Structure 1
Amino acid sequence: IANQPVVIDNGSGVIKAGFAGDQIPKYCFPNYVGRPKHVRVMAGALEGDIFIGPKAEEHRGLLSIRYPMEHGIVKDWNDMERIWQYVYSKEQLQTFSEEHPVLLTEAPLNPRKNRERAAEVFFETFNVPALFISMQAVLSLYATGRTTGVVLDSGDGVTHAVPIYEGFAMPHSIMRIDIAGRDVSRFLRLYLRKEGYDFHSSSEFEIVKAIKERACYLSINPQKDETLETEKAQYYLPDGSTIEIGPSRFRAPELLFRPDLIGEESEGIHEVLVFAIQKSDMDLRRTLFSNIVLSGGSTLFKGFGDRLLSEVKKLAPKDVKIRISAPQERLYSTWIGGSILASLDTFKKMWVSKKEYEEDGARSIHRKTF
C-alpha cells in the first residue's frame, strides 16, 4: 500500500497540509481550536461547537481561541487530534487517513514523550499505514537543493540552528531557544497596553499578530533609534479605530536579539547562529558561515537579515565571507522539502510501518528518526 503520501508540516503558529510532489501547500491555516464564548439562543447558528481553519478566522469574535502547541510541544492532545482530523476531513483534504503514508514534522530536541504520543495518535486513533518524523533544517535544505547549510529558522514557537554539512546533521551542535514569533507578539501586546490600547481576549490577540506581521521593522542600531524620537505610524483595526503604534513597532522584534527584554536570559537568534557554527568542528566552520539559510515567519521582519549580518560580523572571526541566504518561499520551505523527500524512492525505507510499530513500539520510532 504505497499511495501518494501526505505532508503535515506541524507548528504552533501555522499548520501546512497537502500531497507529495507539489510546488506549494494547497492547505495552509493557523494551528488553533476555536470554541464559542457566548450562548446560541437563535436557531440556524454556526453548528459543530468546534471551529478550525477559515471558519475560525472568519468568526474570531465568538470563539475563545486556544493554541494547543506551545514551543513545538502540544499541551492539549485532544485539540491536536481534532485539528489533524479536520485536516483529513472533507473540509480540506477530502481523503481517508488509511490510504496515504504520513510525513510528520517536529522541532529538534523536543520531549520524546510527545513524539511517542504523536505516533500513538496517527497509528491508533487514525489508522495510518506508515508514519515518518523529520526535522525542520533537513527539509529546508531539501527545498533549496543544497546539502551544506546552517538553517537559522524562526517560527511562532521555536527558534533554532542545526548545522548540516554535506548530509551530516551534527546533533550536539544544535542550539535551541523557546523565544520566537508568539513571544514577540505577546511582547508587542504588553507594549501596546503601556502605550494605551489594551487587548486581552484570545480572539483579540490575533489583531496583535496582524499588527506585528504588517507594521514592524528591525533597527540596525537600536541605541540610535532610542535617542531619536519616532514618527508614530498609524494602523486601522477591523473595528476602524486608529492606533498610533509609536516606538513599540521597532522595540517588539528586539526580543529576538535581546531576550533579556521579556526577562528570560537566553542566547538570542544571532548568538544561536554563531554558537551553532562554533560548536561544530574546526574545518567545517568556514563552509557553515558561507551557507547560512533562513526560514520561518519571524525572519520576515524588515531589516532582519541586514541586522543578522551585522551581528555575525561583530561576533565571528574577521575577514570571513558571510552569506545569509533566504529563499522567496521561506514560510513553506519546510513543507516543500517534505514534499520532495516524500516523492523520492528512498522515502519507503526511512518510514515506520504500522506492522513494525505493533511489533516493537516506541523504540523502533526512536531508532528510525536517528
Structure 2
Amino acid sequence: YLMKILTERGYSFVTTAEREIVRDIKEKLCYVALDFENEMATAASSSSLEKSYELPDGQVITIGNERFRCPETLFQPSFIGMESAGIHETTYNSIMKCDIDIRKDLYANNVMSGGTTMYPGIADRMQKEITALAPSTMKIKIIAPPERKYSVWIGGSILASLSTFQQMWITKQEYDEAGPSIVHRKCF
C-alpha cells in the first residue's frame, strides 16, 4: 500500500530492491495518528509535517500524509479492499467470546509483540479505541515493552532453559518409528 501511495505522490517503485528501500523508509519515517481527520486537516496546512529522506542515489523524497496513512490500514482494512475488521475490533471480539469473569483480567493485561507494532503512538490509539468500545467503568492498560522485537526468541530461550521442559522434547527414537504424524499428537 505504501508503494501504491508513493506512486500517487509521484515516486515509482516496482522491483524488489525498491521494495527493500520502501521497507526501510517505512521503518524510519512512519507513525500512527491519534485522529485521522485532524491529521488530514493539519496536512492541508502542509508546512510542519513533511519530511525528507535520502535515497542511495542521492535523490531526496518528501513524504507527507503517507507517514500516517499506511499504518491506518491496520485499523481500516477497507483501504486495501479486505472485508474484515481492524486489530481493535478483532481483539474486542476475541475477548468478548471468552468467559465473563476472565474478561476483567484480559482487559487488565494486554501484551503485544512483533515488528509491526513499533510505530510510536500505536499503544495510545489502541488504548483509546478499546476504552471507547469497552464500557467506561473500568481501567484498560496497555503494556509496550521496548524490546518486543525479540520477545519470542527470549521466551523460547527461557522455556528451553526450564528444567521441566528437558523431557518434553521429541527424540529420534520417535521418528525412527512413524511418519511425522507425531508432531501434532504431542509437541504442541
Report the CA distance between 1:361 and its aligned residue.
2.7
Asked whether the 8 Å contact 1:220–1:306 carries over to 2, the reply is: yes
1:196 maps to amino acid: G
- CA distance, structure 1, for counterparts of residue 180 and residue 93 of structure 2: 32
Which ranges in structure 2 are unaligned for 5 or more consecutive residues? Answer: none
Q: 1:225 aligns with which of 6, 21, 39?
A: 39
Report the CA distance between 1:360 and its aligned residue.
3.2
Q: 1:325 aligns with which of 134, 143, 159?
A: 143
Q: 1:279 aligns with which of 97, 102, 108?
A: 97
* SS of residue matched to 2:92: helix
1:203 aligns with 2:17: yes
Residue matched to 1:193: 7
Report the CA distance between 1:301 and its aligned residue.
0.5
Greater RCO between the two (CA within 8 Å, min separation 6)? 1
User: How many residues were matched structurally?
Assistant: 184
1:276-324 deviations in whole A, cap 9, x for unaligned?
Answer: 2111111100000111011111111021101011110111122121111
Residue matched to 2:129: 311
Residue matched to 2:79: 261
2:161 maps to amino acid: S
Query: Greater share of strand residues, 1 or 2?
Result: 1
Residue matched to 1:334: 152
Report the CA distance between 1:363 and its aligned residue.
2.6
Tell me the TM-score normalized by structure 1.
Answer: 0.48
Asked whether the 8 Å contact 2:34–2:125 carries over to 1, the reply is: yes
Residue matched to 1:366: 184
Asked whether the 8 Å contact 1:193–1:199 carries over to 2, the reply is: yes
Residue matched to 1:148: none
Residue matched to 2:171: 353
- CA distance, structure 1, for counterparts of residue 168 and residue 85 of structure 2: 34
1:246 aligns with 2:74: no
* SS of residue matched to 1:234: strand
* SS of residue matched to 1:352: coil
2:27 maps to amino acid: E
RMSD over aligned Cα atoms: 1.3
- CA distance, structure 2, for counterparts of residue 347 and residue 240 of structure 1: 53
Report the CA distance between 1:358 and its aligned residue.
2.6
Tell me the TM-score normalized by structure 2.
Answer: 0.92
Query: Greater share of helix residues, 1 or 2?
Result: 2
Report the CA distance between 1:203 and its aligned residue.
1.4
- CA distance, structure 2, for counterparts of residue 234 and residue 219 of structure 1: 19
1:328 maps to amino acid: P
Give runs of aligned pairs for residues 130-145 of structure 1, distance below 5 A. none
1:311-339 deviations in whole A, cap 9, x for unaligned?
Answer: 10111122121111121211000000000
* SS of residue matched to 1:208: helix
- CA distance, structure 2, for counterparts of residue 346 and residue 361 of structure 1: 27
Residue matched to 1:38: none
Q: Percent identity?
A: 48
- CA distance, structure 1, for counterparts of residue 86 and residue 107 of structure 2: 17
1:205-243 deviations in whole A, cap 9, x for unaligned?
Answer: 111111111111111010111233243211111221100
- CA distance, structure 1, for counterparts of residue 28 and residue 143 of structure 2: 23
Report the CA distance between 1:350 and its aligned residue.
2.2
